[PDB]
Ligand binder design. Structure first.
Ligand SMILES: Nc1ccn([C@H]2C[C@H](O)[C@@H](COP(=O)(O)OP(=O)(O)OP(=O)(O)O)O2)c(=O)n1
Ligand SMILES: [Ca+2]
Ligand SMILES: [Ca+2]
Ligand SMILES: [Ca+2]
Ligand SMILES: [Ca+2]
Ligand SMILES: [Ca+2]
Ligand SMILES: [Ca+2]
Length: 901
DNA sequence: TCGTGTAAGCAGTCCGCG
DNA sequence: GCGGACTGCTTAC
């Protein structure tokens, strides 16, 4: 097999590399890598190296990496560009793996771990590590085993061995319900003392050294705690055994309001799963506790125990250990679903970066572009300092707030990357500038043609057309990968709807789910077999189809994120190819494209309808248009349709056969006008929306920019078994909105769109009447909490104190003195509840850590003093009044003349 | 919230608005 | 009360 790296580090003048050799064995080597860098040279000097602008360069080979680094400094001192890859380990990887890396995940040691630390005096700070580590569960992907290290003797209590037999039993048998499928995979090791536990853990770590290290909050808690605890007990040298090269450093992570420390373990790639989740999941969660996320992702119940976690070991060590094991497994289960580790390996090896660098689109693209240019013996420019400057982005049309009955939407495929490719936008393809007219003049095609030679953006920039720039070439490669995976995702989605339809008529039989590839549209044969399957088999197939869809979603949306990240990186001062001319060339072209096609679509539909100046495009944002289809439906007449699916079919055909060709004609003209390299503005139908045929539903409504709701029957070729609400921006979509209020607002919207005014009024009256019964957590608001200290004046709110911060200050006074009480953590999320006038907390609201029950110290009083009236008005009535006033309907029945009977 | 970008919505504070 | 200037937070793209 072809070799591939696992990890790479620079340590002084050495590259330390862990890799899989040609025989599939893990090896480590130290290489005295001599880096090369470049300087511009005279044109008369014969060379094969050229910078991206075609200027000749001389290669400078250094005796060692420190010499190269010193030379860069002196070049700055002199005032001359020092060209080439200054991150020498990226250059090392490029030299050592000069081919497309094919990796074998089965050879990569992925470790998932979690620790427990009993602490009587509050949160055990990892930088202090003053409390014993009393449990470690460490899962190893190569062994496929859970290694459990259990401390039986501690200053906080001596306990008996954990019982695998009790662990396996149902919670209803007094067990812990450790999943049967991992029972045989547990290797349990009890310890008489913590020193023995940690010494054995390090020996184990040396034998089975993680390449990828993950878990939940491992970078911020588990790793620093273990490192510092071992340091405290044994000294620095022993703690450094966590690194295969015995090198670690404290890294200070800075943000806007403070800093925290992590431990860099040289020769390990730490991919904390909470951070993978935040980057790759495209969710914004009210809480990021593992309990909360596992419930959300896997629909598993809360890991239930009595009393505080600080007393759990002494009271129920059995459960303590089982829950530690289950915590490790839950991360594996989330990864089995989301496949973020797989994604990270894919992206990291593709770019030829340290795997942990996948968190950085700038580092990722720097490597991709460097490797690409190096293939042509081209030399990358030096990174420069730039002041942060604001620049313009997308256009968003102001919609007229209203109900909109029939709506068809259209959207440009991968807009910003498509613009980059169409226009040929790259650092080295800049050809010059032209004199810009106001954007309106290009939109309406009255401005002079920018260039008869070069490819243009309406920001004034011109680009070469003779050859593709490196940015277009590389972005195209990732776009093509993205497209493949999006294909699999949509197939799995369509396949899911086939199964949902079949579930209306399940067969009374005993059978098995079909062995199929859900990434491909079901054949006629498969569809026929599905129609004969039992509910049990169908439901298993639906689960599998949905899991396939999720895997496709992970693969495609994050490749989309990477390519859109390149467009954004052009506007980040730390990117090697930072250039606001290029960043604005993209965004300004986007503004033109949207408004150009709005005009073309309006012109086309006015022609087909025989009207003048009527606005068919009701809304657009960045690269999408929403088209009112009322007049198209009305031209055949609602009475002529057999059912909802009939008019959906009709609009689908109208969009594909009439509107899309008109749109493509419109964009081809725009391409010619801007003299672009290649026509890549591909705008296809997205949504078909409307009320159910014969209903009083309103179909859709807009309240403002980025705030709308649609009842969708077909989305990108997926014909739903049941209509799906597409709600954007409204409170149903916001993590700050209480959970039960999201639910209620969604049902209000469903009724508005599908059933009409009377249905909405019936539901509102009931919710208003019953909502006080809802669990307090379900009706609490949520907010991130920054700058708590700034607004804290002797425990009380200072000037301009935000509402949620005031709630935290109230909480802090109420728990003052109690060392065990859960503390609000700066930068994390809180639940927030309003308090009634005259409450014992002395203020109008209280806040506590999100994803948790409020401490029993104050729970009863919070419940007693909760202001239900304010809660309802603020979170429910106010947003609903917004929806209904926009939609021109009433959530309460108005008086009429009939009331007199 | 260490980690690519801008546009733009709503909650809430402070305080004007005769 | 509502609305502007401002901060804070959270979406859509
Ligand atoms: N997180 C995001 C989302 C969007 N955009 C920009 C780049 C996109 O190209 C454009 C339009 O956003 P879309 O959500 O419609 O995404 P794309 O057009 O890129 O992809 P798709 O093919 O799925 O429509 O907005 C961005 O910079 N960052
Ligand atoms: Ca725990
Ligand atoms: Ca798009
Ligand atoms: Ca599309
Ligand atoms: Ca059937
Ligand atoms: Ca879009
Ligand atoms: Ca206001």
């Amino acid at each position: 097999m072809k070799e591939f790296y696992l990890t790479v580090e620079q340590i002084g003048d050495s590259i330390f590399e862990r890799y899989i050799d040609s025989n599939g064995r893990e090896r480590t080597r130290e290489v005295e890598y001599k880096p090369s860098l470049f300087a511009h040279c005279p044109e008369s000097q014969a060379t094969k190296y050229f910078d991206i602008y075609g200027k000749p360069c001389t290669r400078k080979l250094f005796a060692n990496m420190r010499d190269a680094s010193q030379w860069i400094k002196r070049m700055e001192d002199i005032g001359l560009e020092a060209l080439g890859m200054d991150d020498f380990k990226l250059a090392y990887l490029s030299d050592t793996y000069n081919y497309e890396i094919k990796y074998d995940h089965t050879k990569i040691r992925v470790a998932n771990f979690d620790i427990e630390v009993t602490s009587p005096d509050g949160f055990p700070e990892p930088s202090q590590a003053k409390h014993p580590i009393d449990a470690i569960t460490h899962y190893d992907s190569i062994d496929d085993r859970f290694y459990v290290f259990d401390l039986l003797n501690s200053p906080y209590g001596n306990v008996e061995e954990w019982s695998i037999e009790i662990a396996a039993k149902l919670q209803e048998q007094g067990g812990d319900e450790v999943p049967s499928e991992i029972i045989d995979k547990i290797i349990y090791m009890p310890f008489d003392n913590e020193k023995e536990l940690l010494m054995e853990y390090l020996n184990f770590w040396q034998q089975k050294t993680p390449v990828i290290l993950t878990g939940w909050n491992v970078e911020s808690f588990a790793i620093p705690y273990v490192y510092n605890r071992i340091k405290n007990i044994f000294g620095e040298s022993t703690a450094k055994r966590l690194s295969p090269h015995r090198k670690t450093r404290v890294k200070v992570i800075e943000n806007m309001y403070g800093s925290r420390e992590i431990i860099t373990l040289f020769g390990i790639s730490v991919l904390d799963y909470i951070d993978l989740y935040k980057k790759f999941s495209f969710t914004n969660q009210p809480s990021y506790s593992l309990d909360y996320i596992s419930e959300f992702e896997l629909n598993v119940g809360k890991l239930k125990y009595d009393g505080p976690i600080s007393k759990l070991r002494e009271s129920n060590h059995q459960r303590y250990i089982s829950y530690n094991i289950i915590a490790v497994y839950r991360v594996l289960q989330i990864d089995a679903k989301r496949q973020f580790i797989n994604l990270s390996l894919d992206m990291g090896y593709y770019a030829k970066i340290q795997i942990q660098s996948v968190f950085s689109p700038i580092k990722t693209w720097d490597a991709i572009i460097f490797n690409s240019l190096k293939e042509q013996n081209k030399v990358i420019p030096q990174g420069r300092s730039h002041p942060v400057q604001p620049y313009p982005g997308a256009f968003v049309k102001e919609p007229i707030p209203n109900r909109y009955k029939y709506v068809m939407s259209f959207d440009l495929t991968s807009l910003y990357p498509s613009i980059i490719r169409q226009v040929n936008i790259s650092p080295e393809t800049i050809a010059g500038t032209f004199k810009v007219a106001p954007l309106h003049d290009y939109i309406n095609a009255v401005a002079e043609r920018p260039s008869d030679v070069y490819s243009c953006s309406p920001n004034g920039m011109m680009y070469y057309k003779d050859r593709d720039g490196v940015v277009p070439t590389e972005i195209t490669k990732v776009f093509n990968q993205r497209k493949e995976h999006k294909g699999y995702m949509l197939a799995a989605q369509r396949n899911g709807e086939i199964i949902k339809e079949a579930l209306h008529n399940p067969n009374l039989s005993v059978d098995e789910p079909l062995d199929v590839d859900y990434r491909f549209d079901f054949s006629d044969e498969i569809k026929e077999k599905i129609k004969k399957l039992s509910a049990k088999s169908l439901n298993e197939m639906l689960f599998r189809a949905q899991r396939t869809e999720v895997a496709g979603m992970t693969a495609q949306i994050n490749r989309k994120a990477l390519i859109n990240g390149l467009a954004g990186a052009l506007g980040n001062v730390w990117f090697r190819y930072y250039d606001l001319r290029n960043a604005t060339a993209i965004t300004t072209f986007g503004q033109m494209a949207l408004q150009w096609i709005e005009r073309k679509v309006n012109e086309y539909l006015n022609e087909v309808c025989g009207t003048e100046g009527e606005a068919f495009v009701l809304y657009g944002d960045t690269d999408s248009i929403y088209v009112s289809a009322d007049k198209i439906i009305d031209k055949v007449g609602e009475s002529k349709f057999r059912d909802t699916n009939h008019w959906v079919d009709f609009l689908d055909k109208f969009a594909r056969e009439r509107m899309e060709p008109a749109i493509d004609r419109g964009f081809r003209e725009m391409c010619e006008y801007m003299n672009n390299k290649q026509h890549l503005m591909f705008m296809d139908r997205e949504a078909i929306a409307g009320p159910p045929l014969g209903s009083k539903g309103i179909g859709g409504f807009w309240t403002g920019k980025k705030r709308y709701a649609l009842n969708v029957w077909d989305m990108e070729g997926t014909r739903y078994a049941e209509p799906k609400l597409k709600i954007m921006g409204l409170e149903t979509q916001k993590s700050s909105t209480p959970k039960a209020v999201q639910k209620a607002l969604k049902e209000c919207i469903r009724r508005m769109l599908q059933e009409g005014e009377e249905s909405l009024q019936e539901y509102f009256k009931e919710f208003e009447k019953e909502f006080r019964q809802l669990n307090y957590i379900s009706i609490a608001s949520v907010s991130s909490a920054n700058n708590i200290a700034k607004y804290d004046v002797g425990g009380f709110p200072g000037p301009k104190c935000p509402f949620h911060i005031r709630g935290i200050l109230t909480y802090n006074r109420a728990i003052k003195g109690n060392i065990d009480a859960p503390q609000v953590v700066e930068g994390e999320k809180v639940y927030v509840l309003p308090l009634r006038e005259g409450n014992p907390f002395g203020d109008k609201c209280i806040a506590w850590p999100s994803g948790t029950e409020i401490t029993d110290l104050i729970k009863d009083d919070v419940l007693h003093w909760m202001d239900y009236t304010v809660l309802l008005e603020k979170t429910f009535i106010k947003p609903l009044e917004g929806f209904t006033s926009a939609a021109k309907l009433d959530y309460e029945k108005k008086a009429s003349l009939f009331d007199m009977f």
